[PDB]
Structure formats: C-alpha cells, structure tokens
Design an enzyme around this catalytic site. Structure first.
Site, mmCIF file in Angstrom:
data_model
loop_
_atom_site.group_PDB
_atom_site.id
_atom_site.type_symbol
_atom_site.label_atom_id
_atom_site.label_comp_id
_atom_site.label_asym_id
_atom_site.label_seq_id
_atom_site.Cartn_x
_atom_site.Cartn_y
_atom_site.Cartn_z
ATOM 1 N N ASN A 303 22.606 34.086 138.731
ATOM 2 C CA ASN A 303 21.722 33.436 139.698
ATOM 3 C C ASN A 303 22.451 32.327 140.457
ATOM 4 O O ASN A 303 22.207 31.140 140.270
ATOM 5 C CB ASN A 303 20.478 32.874 139.010
ATOM 6 N N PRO A 305 22.237 31.529 143.691
ATOM 7 C CA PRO A 305 21.420 30.663 144.553
ATOM 8 C C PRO A 305 20.817 29.486 143.818
ATOM 9 O O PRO A 305 20.985 28.338 144.245
ATOM 10 C CB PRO A 305 20.346 31.619 145.074
ATOM 11 N N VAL A 306 20.112 29.742 142.718
ATOM 12 C CA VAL A 306 19.513 28.655 141.958
ATOM 13 C C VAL A 306 20.583 27.714 141.446
ATOM 14 O O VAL A 306 20.390 26.499 141.408
ATOM 15 C CB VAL A 306 18.662 29.202 140.803
ATOM 16 N N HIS A 307 21.736 28.249 141.060
ATOM 17 C CA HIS A 307 22.743 27.377 140.471
ATOM 18 C C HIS A 307 23.348 26.450 141.505
ATOM 19 O O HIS A 307 23.613 25.284 141.212
ATOM 20 C CB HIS A 307 23.852 28.175 139.807
ATOM 21 N N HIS A 340 11.180 27.867 133.637
ATOM 22 C CA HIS A 340 11.056 29.120 132.906
ATOM 23 C C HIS A 340 9.698 29.221 132.231
ATOM 24 O O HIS A 340 8.982 30.209 132.413
ATOM 25 C CB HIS A 340 12.187 29.254 131.894
#
Ligand SMILES: CCCCCCCC/C=C/CCCCCCCC(=O)O[C@H](COC(=O)CCCCCCCCCCCCCCC)COP(=O)(O)OCCN
Ligand SMILES: CCCCCCCC/C=C\CCCCCCCC(=O)O[C@H](COC(=O)CCCCCCCCCCCCCCC)COP(=O)(O)OCCN
Ligand SMILES: CCCCCCCC/C=C\CCCCCCCC(=O)O[C@H](COC(=O)CCCCCCCCCCCCCCC)COP(=O)(O)OCCN
Ligand SMILES: CCCCCCCC/C=C\CCCCCCCC(=O)O[C@H](COC(=O)CCCCCCCCCCCCCCC)COP(=O)(O)OCCN
Lengths: 406, 406
Positions: A303, A305-307, A340
């Site tokens: 991931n 993008p999120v990172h 989450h």
C-alpha cells in the site's frame, strides 16, 4: 575460454538471480487454464444482464433508501465544504487559525458522520457499509493532504510576495478538486503527471482482470471457506483458544489466497483501470512487498499510497512539529490500527478489538522476524506472518459475522 | 522534491521489474504448509526402515539378477576402456585414426549394449531400465567430451612441442576420470573449478528437497493422475484423436506439475547434492527458462549441461568441420529427438514414434510463438507449449504402459 566458471544455481539463495517474472506468467497461465471455461460461462450468464441502467434507475426510484450509496453521494458535501473553506481563505478571509478549525471540523465530521449513519441504521448491508466507510476514509486522507498542500503552497506565496505548471491560487477549481478525489493517490499535488492516451487495450485487460479475479474470489469463498465454516458454525467469541486455532488452521490458506487476490484485484487492476480512465501516469500503487525479508519492509511497501501519505503528512510533520521518532512511529501504529478496526469493525458492528490486538502483535513479530531470520528465510517468515498475521483478525471478524447471521 | 513521478505498476508488462524472488519463497512456504504433516509422517514411517545396507546385501546375494544395476555397474567397463585407449595413445601407440576408431567403437557400444540388454531381458523393471539407459547416455556424452578434450589438448601439445593447473598428459588418472564421470557436467575439462568446503547444511537442505519433492511427485501421481487414468483405462494407441484429446486435457496439468517437480528435484536438488558432495563449484545446471519468451530461448536454457555439450561438441564442430548452419541445427534436432525416443521408448518397449513427432511439432510451434507473441504473452505461449508441448508425448507413452499392464 574456460567452459566452467565458479558460480551458483539460479534457485539458490546465495546466487542473487531475482528475475522470476515467469513464475507470474505461470500463475496467470494456470489460473486461466483452470478457470477460463467457468469464467466464459459466468460472463455470458452474468454479462447478459441489464445491470447498468436498471440498478441506477432503481436506486433513483427510492433515495433515502440504500443508505450506503446515499452516504457515498453525501461525501460530496464534505468535499465541497473543504474546497469552499480553501477557496475562501485563498484570498482574504479566515485567518489561518479559523481555516484550520474549519478544516479540522470538516475532517472529524468526515470520520464521525458515516460511522454514525452506519451504526444508527439497520437497513445498511455490511459490504455497502464497508464501501461507504472506505470511501470516506479515502476522502479523509485525500482532504487532509489537500489542506496540507494548499497550506504549504500558500505559505510559500505569502513569503515570496516579499522577496504548463499551474501556480497555487489557480488550482482551486472544481475540475481540479474532483479530479484529485478520483485519482489513485492520497497525496495532493498541483500538476499531477499525466499519461499520453487511454490505451483501450490496457483498460480492457484491467477490466478483464477485475472480473476474473472477482469470480475467482467468489469461487474461493463459496467453495473452500463457506463449507469449512459451515462444518462448525460456532462464533469465535465463544470458542476457546484451542478450538479457535483448530479452526483457523483450516481457514488460513483460503483466507490468504483471498487476500492475495484482493491485493491484486484492487492495488493493481482496479487502481490501474481508474488511473487509465482518467490518465494519471504515476501508477506506483505498490512495491515489491513479496520479496520483503522483514515485516518493517513489508509495511513500508504494501500500500504505497497510504504509506507515502503517512510518511509525508503524518510522520515527517511530527518529526518537524516536535521530536521523539519513537513517538512518531507509535503514532503511526496507533493511526493505522484505529483505521483498521474502524474499517473492519464498524461495518460488522462488532468491537471485539481483534484487529487492534493483531496490529499490536505485529510489533513483537516484526522484531522476532527481523532479528532471527535473514534473506529468503526472512522472506518465508514474512509470508508466514501474512498467512496468520493480520488477515486472520479480519477473518475472525467476518467468520463471527457469518455464523451469527446465517 | 516531487512526490509523483510518471511510472508503471510493478506487475505491468511495460514496467520491467523482474524481482519476483518471493513468488518462489511463497511456493515453498505453501508447499511446506500443505505437505509438511504428511512429509514428517512419511519420513518417520519410511526413514525408520533398514534400507541402506539391506538392499545392497540383497543385490549382492544374486548378481546377474536385477539387470539394471548390473548394467549400471558394467558401464565401468566402457569407462575403463575409454580411459585405456586414451592413456595408451597418450604416449606412443594407436595413431589418431586407430584411437578414433577404438573410441567410436566404444561409444557405439555404450549406446547399443544397454538397449540390447534392456530389450532382450524380461526381468528388468522399466524405471530401472530408464535409469540404466540414462546413466549410459550420460556416460556416452561424458566420454564423447572426454575424447574431444583430450584430442584437443594433445594436438596442442604436439604442435607446441615444435614451437595448480594440470597439464595434458598428467590428467589421465583413474581418480580424475572417475571424478569426471560423477561430476554434474557433460563437458570434460582439466582443472574443474572447486568449492571450498562441503557445507553440511547445504547438503542437508538438498537431501531434504529431494525427499520432499519425491514424496510430492508420488502424491501428484497417485492422487491426481492414477485415478484419472483408471477412470478410463484405454490405451492411447487405440483411442481416436477426439478421445485422446479429451483425456489429455484431463491429464495435462498434473503431468505439467510432475514435470516441473522433476526439473527442480533433478536439475537443482539432485545435481547440487552431487556437486556439493564432490565439491564442484560450477553449478550452472539451468538458466532462467521460465522467463523465456520464445521456444528457441527455452531449449537453449533448459538443461544447460546438455546444451553446452551440444554447442561445443556437436554444433560448433559441424560448423567447423563443414558448413550449412541449417544442417547443424537440424542435426542437433535429430540427435535430441533420437535420444528422447531412446530414453522414453526403449524402457517402455514401445516404438509408437510419439516423442519424435512431438519433438518435430516443436518446430512449427517454435516459429509460431516466435512470430506472433512477444514479451509476457510470448512467455505465456511458451508455458502453454510446455503444458501440452513435449511432456505430453512422454505422458502418452507412460499412460499406454500403465493401462496395458495394470
Ligand atoms: C468457449 C471456450 C472456452 C475456453 C477457451 C477460451 C478461454 C479464454 C480465456 C479467457 C480469460 C481471459 C481473462 C483472464 C484473466 C487475465 C487477463 C489478462 O489478459 O491478464 C494479463 C496476463 O496475461 C499474461 O500474463 C499472458 C497472457 C496469458 C494467456 C493465457 C491463455 C491460456 C489459454 C486460453 C484458453 C484456455 C482454455 C481452457 C480449457 C480447459 C495481464 O497481463 P500483465 O502481464 O499483468 O500485463 C498486461 C498489461 N501490461
Ligand atoms: C520443526 C521442523 C521444521 C518445520 C516442519 C517441517 C517442514 C518441512 C521440512 C522440510 C522440507 C523443505 C522443502 C523445501 C526446502 C527449501 C530449503 C530452503 O532453504 O528454502 C528457502 C525458502 O524456503 C524457506 O525458507 C521455507 C522455510 C519454512 C517455511 C514453512 C513453514 C515451516 C514451519 C511450519 C510448518 C507447519 C506444518 C503444518 C501445517 C498444518 C530458500 O530457498 P532455496 O531455493 O531452497 O535455497 C536454499 C539454499 N540456498
Ligand atoms: C484453480 C486455479 C489454480 C491455480 C494454480 C496455479 C496458480 C498458483 C497460485 C497462486 C499464485 C500466487 C502468486 C504470488 C502471490 C504474490 C503476488 C500476487 O499478488 O499475485 C497475484 C495474486 O494471485 C493469487 O494469489 C492467485 C490465487 C490462486 C487461487 C487458487 C485457487 C485454487 C482452487 C482449487 C483448484 C483445484 C484443482 C483441482 C484439484 C484436484 C497474482 O497475480 P497475477 O495475476 O499473476 O499477475 C500478472 C499480471 N500480468
Ligand atoms: C481444497 C482443495 C484441495 C486441497 C489442496 C490441494 C493442494 C495440492 C495440489 C496441487 C499442488 C501440487 C504441486 C504444485 C507445485 C509443483 C512444484 C513446483 O512448482 O516446484 C518448483 C518448480 O519451479 C520451477 O521449475 C519454476 C517454474 C514454475 C514455478 C513454480 C510454481 C509453484 C506452484 C506452487 C503452488 C503453491 C500451492 C501448493 C499446494 C500444495 C520448485 O520451486 P521451489 O521449491 O519453490 O524452489 C525455490 C527454493 N529453492
């Protein structure tokens, strides 16, 4: 010369070959050979339907019903509100404190409104609940980055005022904002890179991958996991640790395959279809997390993008606006675990705090795998850490929600 | 800088990532997770036996019986005969014509004697027949290279006589020859490279891989293919093309998996165990044939030992000793097809000339895949060309031999 050198076999650890593109083409060839007849069958049988314009007209028949698309459409209110406070403080009004308060209110509302609608409504499906909450957390991250980038390119202009590419105050257009909102990225940026053309063949292959892997996930669930769960329909919250483990050992491998197909179907096929429709050109949605010989390298490449949103809107600012790298890392952990358990446990209405405990246990597990194993054994340790790991928490949530309903 | 470049997803064709070592570790992790309980079970159940010294004493009880180990042991006669004609013409006797005739007689005898013993004996198992013929074709190629290399390093000495490393006439020792005969190579060479040590851990892992993949092949056959064949026990020589294809479609994928496990188990695990026991250090037994986007690149990288033996003892000499590159390539094709139908069809006593027709059909298929498909689609075409391809010919032979006996 000399017909015999002193080298190693390509499959050996100490060889460092790493050109196994063809173990991927093999998996594609075999998935196709094993599911192509059934996929053509289900495509003629499901593609013959009149889905496109009938479901939209049916939803438009009764708005205020189907609350999940209602929520997703209402997200435009928060989008426009952020754009409005921006374009309003872009010229004269809302001194930085006032604008920051308006944006914090908008963000907290983006987070707390769909949770409220989801919990305080009984007619909302859990998959649609999840789509609404995931759309709204994506919008939250996007608008956080929007606020940050505009604040930066506005402080820069305010400074430089007393010393092709679009400058700062000319990017605040609805076209721009609503292109950003549908971009496969979480980091706002003036002048996104762009692809030359649309490449109908690429888009077609992406749509085919999405359809194929959707049918493949349906096969996996309905023929490997739903039977196994229905053999012993007992909730995980009531079973003991021994029986929980006895059942999770039976459920892990199908769950792992489903999660690999989710990763592909979403972070490659769906995001590339989106980025190809609206030519986006960046298209680094993931990095090689599969050859990740540590859990810390796994999280930093699963991931992307999120990172990168994390690293340049939530971690680097904490190091700047303060200290204690340890505190920045633990804040990142806290935010990830919150999101989450907010994505997995609000749709399922459960709050067993399992996703959080798994996200925690990732920490000692990360230290363990980083200290003991190395190279390909570390990579196998990470593959274990994904087979049981975190996805088992989401599996427990969904298993409880399945056996408590049907 | 700029948080968004213009790049491609790693799984995309036009990205050129190719670092998928970890799609291999994944296959290892999953094979282990799926077969480890049964492998420990079959290892305690079969490893507890007294196999090692009981089977050898049993064979020594009745030599002239078990004709396959008898043949393999008699191969030492041809080994010693080649060494004798070499070490004899090394000094004074057997002018090059006489020595070449002795060596040609020895080679033709290596090829025609085990075939004779196999065909003219009924008490020889087909697996043991295959081991004898494969040991003798390996010995044939090894001794061909032996003759060639000694002829070269002798012509060179004869020339230079009228102008650490071992010179020519001092390498003709039984130690040297019988090290070469058990070396994982077909090209003779004075001063083979050498590994520093034995690396008991490496040898143990290789033996474990051999045992594991042997048990895995047994599982594959006995639980995926023997049932499917026994559903319709009808020989392929009597069925029609339609029914042949209807059955081969059911048999292909298990056959393909068995052949992949053969490739690994033999060209990596077995050959590395051998090369590690007798420190050999070269260890390039294969190249990346999996990411081979053409059939011609596949053949040139599957089975590196045989291929380099070909290229520097049977193809380059034909270009030197003559012309017509086309004729050299077709001679290579002929020799490969002969050896294939001699390894697959003499043990099974069949001569349906199927392996030859498949080896032929590889040619139009190679042209087709080379012309039409490219890149990853060419690689998928090659994977198809291996799923049906040549291994189906060997499958037909073994299927006929199974249904005609049990
Ligand atoms: C009525 C007769 C039915 C059986 C025969 C027809 C079957 C037709 C098959 C349809 C399935 C098509 C969708 C499969 C899912 C994958 C889609 C696809 O093209 O994926 C691509 C992957 O493809 C590859 O890697 C190479 C192409 C593989 C083709 C394999 C063909 C197998 C044989 C087909 C026939 C199967 C018959 C089975 C009978 C039991 C995407 O590629 P990428 O490498 O990630 O990058 C591309 C962008 N840079
Ligand atoms: C407690 C005893 C050990 C665990 C239980 C037995 C597992 C099976 C044992 C042996 C069979 C191994 C067959 C494959 C061997 C692969 C060797 C290896 O190092 O693979 C490496 C990659 O594979 C690994 O690291 C695998 C490590 C184990 C992962 C699987 C988990 C094992 C422990 C849990 C088992 C649970 C079984 C029961 C499940 C219900 C590197 O690759 P390479 O090409 O082989 O190169 C090595 C030399 N450079
Ligand atoms: C029925 C289908 C059987 C297929 C067996 C061969 C395939 C091997 C299985 C899994 C491949 C795992 C690949 C590595 C995972 C990490 C990377 C990743 O995310 O991979 C992607 C994730 O895909 C997967 O994990 C595949 C999941 C496989 C599900 C297998 C279902 C088996 C069902 C039972 C079959 C029973 C057969 C009969 C038994 C008697 C795959 O990417 P791609 O499409 O190959 O990309 C190419 C783009 N041009
Ligand atoms: C509910 C459904 C029924 C129950 C589940 C049934 C599971 C069993 C069915 C089928 C699996 C049969 C075995 C398939 C794989 C054959 C072995 C194989 O490909 O060997 C590999 C051969 O590979 C090559 O030659 C390279 C080209 C092929 C790529 C390898 C593909 C492996 C596929 C793995 C599938 C994973 C799931 C297996 C489940 C038992 C050896 O690689 P390695 O051990 O990973 O070495 C690296 C460490 N040095």
């Amino acid at each position: 010369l000399r017909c015999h050198r002193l080298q190693d076999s390509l499959f050996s650890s100490d060889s460092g070959f790493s050109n196994y593109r063809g173990i991927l083409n093999w998996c594609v060839v075999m998935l196709i050979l094993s599911n192509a007849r059934l996929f053509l069958e289900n495509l003629i049988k499901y593609g013959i339907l009149v889905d496109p314009i009938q479901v939209v007209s049916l939803f438009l028949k009764d708005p205020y019903s189907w609350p999940a698309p209602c929520l997703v459409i209402a997200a435009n209110v928060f989008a426009v509100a952020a754009f409005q406070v921006e374009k309003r403080l872009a010229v004269g009004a809302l001194t930085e404190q006032a604008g920051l308060l308006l944006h914090v209110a908008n963000l907290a509302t983006i987070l707390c409104f769909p949770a409220a609608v989801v919990l305080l409504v009984e007619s909302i499906t859990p998959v649609g609940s999840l789509l609404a909450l995931m759309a709204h957390t994506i919008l939250f991250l996007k608008l956080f980055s929007y606020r940050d980038v505009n604040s930066w390119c506005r402080r820069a202009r305010a400074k430089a005022a007393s010393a092709h590419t679009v400058s700062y105050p000319d990017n605040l257009t609805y076209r721009d904002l609503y292109y950003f909102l549908f971009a496969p990225t979480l980091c706002y940026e003036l002048n996104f890179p762009r692809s030359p053309r649309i490449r109908k063949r690429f888009l077609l292959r992406r749509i085919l991958e999405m359809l194929f892997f959707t049918q493949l996930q349906v096969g996996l669930i309905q023929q490997w996991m739903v039977p196994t769960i229905q053999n012993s329909m007992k909730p995980f919250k009531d079973m003991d640790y021994s029986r929980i483990i006895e059942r999770l050992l039976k459920l892990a491998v199908p769950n792992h395959l489903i999660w690999l197909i989710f990763f592909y179907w979403l972070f490659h096929s769906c995001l590339n279809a989106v980025a190809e429709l609206m030519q986006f050109g960046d298209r680094e949605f993931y990095r090689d997390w599969w050859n990740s010989e540590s859990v810390t390298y796994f999280w930093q490449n699963w991931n992307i993008p999120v990172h990168k949103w994390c690293i340049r809107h939530f971690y680097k600012p904490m190091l700047r606006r303060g200290s204690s790298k340890w505190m920045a890392r633990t804040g990142v952990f806290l935010a990830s675990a919150f999101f989450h358990e907010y994505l997995v446990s609000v749709p399922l209405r459960m709050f067993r705090l399992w996703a959080f405990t798994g996200m925690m246990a990732q920490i000692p597990l990360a230290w363990f795998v980083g200290r003991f194993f190395q190279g390909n054994y570390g990579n196998a340790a990470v593959w274990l850490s994904l087979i049981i790991g975190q996805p088992i928490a989401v599996l427990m949530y969904v298993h409880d929600y399945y056996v408590l309903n049907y």
